RNA sequence: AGCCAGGAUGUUGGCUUAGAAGCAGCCAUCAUUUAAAGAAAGCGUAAUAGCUCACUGGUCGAGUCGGCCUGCGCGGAAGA
């Protein structure tokens, strides 16, 4: 329980809030919220944020560390956000974004027409690369995977909608 | 150089010392001289803690008891059967 | 040459040109049934090579008990 | 398979199999086996309990075996009603005790000792654990 | 995947955690090392 | 002087300015040529004479400049024909032949001294004394 | 335990040198220093390079690692 007793700190221009269990953080890039659990207590500070494992259940030190570091990925989020590039590896497969829509062409005989939820925005500069952006590490982690669900990286030549960041696992063809 | 920490015990029998090893403790024996034997508790998990050395085994035992210690010899050890504690050790007061 | 580590080939060392990198080495007769079909198949067709004689060498223990009908 | 040469009898009745056991402490070598439960172990699994951690150390030191079938347990054939006499033997076993030295043996390392019993063990239908010679 | 009622860690990098209560082994390099129930 | 993409810390003959299918795979994997490398090699390849092992160090530069530091007989070789023989191994301790002193090697250390400098000049002998223990042989003084 | 600098390797060490360069494994098990360094486990590999591992030289700043004896629970556990 580093993390949990690690304090959250809340640099300018951010606004937090603190009402009850149902935290609202508020700063650059819009507004979340997200309501935490009893096991864990909440006091502001100065200017930082501190949490703790409030009485009655014991294992509150397993929950506030949960409980810290999510708003730890929504600090972050509405100062910054963050973005999930990736990799559509393959001969004849291109990604365009109309809005908010993205029209997957990965070798299908129906055209994948996906759409995205609210809160985040696609860039297509590559038409092998995807570059979600978004506040949350939570709704873009989703998404990137949901990505990966029409067509995962298959271990001889990664044929897929692999992460740019992640090398992926190909094995030997071996044979003929 | 081991130091032992041990009573006299009362009450002795078949049942009575069942009593006492679902205690913690155990009973023995120090005997040998021109004088009466001494049935003597002694803790179990302590002297069970040191009994792997062979310094517990080749040395004059300092047993105290009511004040009074003793130098004894380790004569034998009635350990039990399959769990790795042990039900009885004789002192020989050398 | 992993895969002719497998067919006993007696290697001999690696060797480079202009365009292609050339390694020659010992084969048995018996595992040289189907060569090239395996060759080309470990290559994208962009290999050669050429069988030469050279002795009737040693046939280890494993070689020397199968033929025997 | 381990088996009595020239016995008095053929058969033996068959016996209760209660308290405890003699052979308690690591008497030959350094590392026994000693058993904590409380069954039989016929003649088959004597033989192949050895021979597991025999080629786990492959030549390695003394083996001792401290336990050897005297029991002649029967069995009546198929399709056979009850009574007509007793049946003729099939197997022998030897009645373990709580606190009974299995298999034991020297000249090994300890580690590998503790490794090789592990081998033996499984192929037993008592629980054992890994003693150690003690000094007395 | 494999169903064997004992698991053993085969590997170094082979981690066991409990899914959904039950043991679950999974691995970062060998995908054949995944195993579950024991 | 770069880091490691292409530097290949192996050579055998000096005399022997051809690189025999031993030592080929090194220079094929980057595509060395030694034939006008041979030309670099024999201005201090004469400097030595035949009989005694030599390694290179090969460092290729960014303009495809290729360029080497090469050597003299390093730690191992030297002390096999101190010994008379270039081998006789494969038996460290169940094998004993010849004891040589370190006096002697002290001289053949400053040898090493100019060619591959190993750290401390005894417990470089030390260290390849160690190595006449790992051929087998014997060493006294 | 991580993060950056690392991998403190003489030794392309025999050998079988076609290569077995710490890593084919038999062996010596030498030594450099011995503030961070075994003449070595492991996939990877023709063989080096390799990323690591043993180990943290500086960063942070608190408790921590694995067995033993056991109380109560889980999985093992599929029938008309």
């Not at chain 4, 005297?70 to 022998?92: C, Q, S």
Request: with cysteine; aromatic share 6%; net charge positive.
């Amino acid at each position: 329980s580093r993390v949990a007793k690690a304090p959250v700190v809340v640099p300018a221009g951010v606004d937090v809030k603190i009402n009850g269990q149902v935290i609202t953080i508020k700063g650059k890039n819009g507004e979340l919220t997200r309501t935490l659990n009893d096991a864990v207590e909440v006091k502001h500070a100065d200017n930082t944020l501190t949490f703790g494992p409030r009485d009655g259940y014991a294992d509150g030190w397993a929950q506030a560390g949960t409980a810290r570091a999510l708003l730890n990925s929504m600090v972050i989020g509405v100062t910054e956000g963050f973005t999930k590039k990736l990799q559509l590896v393959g001969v004849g497969y291109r990604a365009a974004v109309k809005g908010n829509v993205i029209n997957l062409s990965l070798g299908f005989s129906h055209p994948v027409d996906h759409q995205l939820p609210a809160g985040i925005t696609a860039e297509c500069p590559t038409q092998t690369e995807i570059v979600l952006k978004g506040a949350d590490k939570q709704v873009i982690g989703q998404v990137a995977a949901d990505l990966r669900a029409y067509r995962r990286p298959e271990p001889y030549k990664g044929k897929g909608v692999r992460y740019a960041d992640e090398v992926v696992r190909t094995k030997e063809a071996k044979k003929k | 150089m081991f130091t032992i920490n041990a009573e006299v015990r009362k009450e002795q029998g078949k049942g009575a010392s069942r009593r006492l090893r679902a205690a913690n403790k155990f009973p023995a024996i120090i005997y040998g001289g021109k004088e009466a034997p001494l049935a003597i508790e002694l803790d179990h998990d302590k002297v069970m803690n040191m009994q792997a050395k062979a310094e517990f085994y080749s040395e004059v035992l300092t047993i105290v008891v009511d004040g009074k210690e003793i130098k004894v010899k380790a004569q034998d050890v009635q350990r039990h059967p399959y769990k790795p504690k042990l039900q009885h050790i004789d002192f020989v007061r050398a | 040459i992993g895969d002719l580590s497998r067919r006993r080939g007696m290697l001999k060392g690696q060797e480079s040109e202009v365009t292609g990198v050339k390694i020659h080495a010992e084969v048995p007769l018996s595992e040289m049934f189907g060569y090239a079909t395996q060759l080309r198949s470990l290559t994208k067709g962009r290999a050669s090579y050429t069988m030469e004689f050279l002795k009737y060498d040693e046939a280890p223990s494993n070689v020397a008990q199968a033929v025997i009908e | 398979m381990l088996q009595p040469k020239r016995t008095k009898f053929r058969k033996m009745h068959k016996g209760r199999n209660r308290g405890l056991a003699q052979g308690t402490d690591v008497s030959f070598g350094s590392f026994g086996l000693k058993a904590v439960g409380r069954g039989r172990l016929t003649a088959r699994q004597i033989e192949a309990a050895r021979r597991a951690m025999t080629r786990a150390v492959k030549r390695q030191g003394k083996i001792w075996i401290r336990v050897f079938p005297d029991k002649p347990i029967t069995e009546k054939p198929l399709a056979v009603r009850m009574g007509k006499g007793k049946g003729n033997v099939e197997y022998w076993v030897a009645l373990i005790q709580p606190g009974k030295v299995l298999y034991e043996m020297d000249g090994v390392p300890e580690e590998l000792a503790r490794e090789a019993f592990k081998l033996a063990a499984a192929k037993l239908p008592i629980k054992t654990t890994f003693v150690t010679k003690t000094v007395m | 995947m494999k169903v064997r009622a004992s698991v053993k860690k085969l590997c170094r990098n082979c981690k066991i955690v409990k899914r959904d209560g039950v043991i679950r082994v999974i691995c970062s390099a060998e995908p054949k090392h995944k195993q579950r129930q024991g | 002087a770069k880091k490691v993409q292409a530097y290949v810390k192996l050579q055998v003959a000096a005399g022997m300015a051809n690189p025999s299918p031993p030592v080929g795979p090194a220079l094929g994997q980057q595509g060395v040529n030694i034939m006008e490398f041979c030309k670099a090699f024999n201005a201090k390849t004469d400097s030595i004479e035949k009989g005694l092992p030599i390694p290179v160090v090969i460092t290729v530069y960014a303009d495809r400049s290729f360029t080497f530091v090469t050597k003299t007989p390093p730690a191992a070789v030297l002390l096999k024909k101190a010994a008379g023989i270039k081998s006789g191994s494969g038996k460290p301790n169940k094998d004993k032949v010849g004891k040589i002193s370190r006096a002697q090697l002290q001289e053949i250390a400053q040898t090493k001294a100019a060619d591959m400098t190993g750290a401390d000049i005894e417990a470089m002998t030390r260290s390849i004394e160690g190595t006449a223990r790992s051929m087998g042989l014997v060493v006294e003084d």
